[PDB]
């Protein structure tokens, strides 16, 4: 997490391929977010904290539009970290997709996947 930000050049050179996303797994309270929190504090920068309920808006259509811009900020001022606190309430493997409410969550996930390759 910390070292490719500092010296991308050493991290590419060594034989590990250019930065790609990290997935952190475990049962509750283990400090998946804790190690991410810790490192971000020391740095003071190269970290964008986004809440996963900030993707969503009241008013429809705007919800995927948010995702693109915030995710884009990282790309211009690269290397930069997009850290989502809790990815769930959006990362559902099931959508109802009949009411406007369900449709909107389904649109955030759809944007997310596209954007992941985009980074």
């Amino acid at each position: 997490v910390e070292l490719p930000l500092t010296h991308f050049e050493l991290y590419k050179q060594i034989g590990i391929d250019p930065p790609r996303g990290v997935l952190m797994y475990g049962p509750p309270g283990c400090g998946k977010t804790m190690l991410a929190k810790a490192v971000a504090h020391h740095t003071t920068a190269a970290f964008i904290r986004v809440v996963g309920s900030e993707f969503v808006q009241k008013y429809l259509g705007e919800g995927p539009r948010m995702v693109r811009d915030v995710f884009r900020l990282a790309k211009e001022n690269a290397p930069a970290i997009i850290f989502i606190d809790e990815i769930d309430a959006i990362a559902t493997k099931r959508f109802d997709a009949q009411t406007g409410a369900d449709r909107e969550v389904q649109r955030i996930l759809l944007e997310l996947l596209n954007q992941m390759d985009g980074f």
Partner: peptide, 13 residues
Amino acid sequence: VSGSELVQKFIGE
């Protein structure tokens, strides 16, 4: 297809 609506849009499943 997983028999869940992973993101599939069409009618929505």
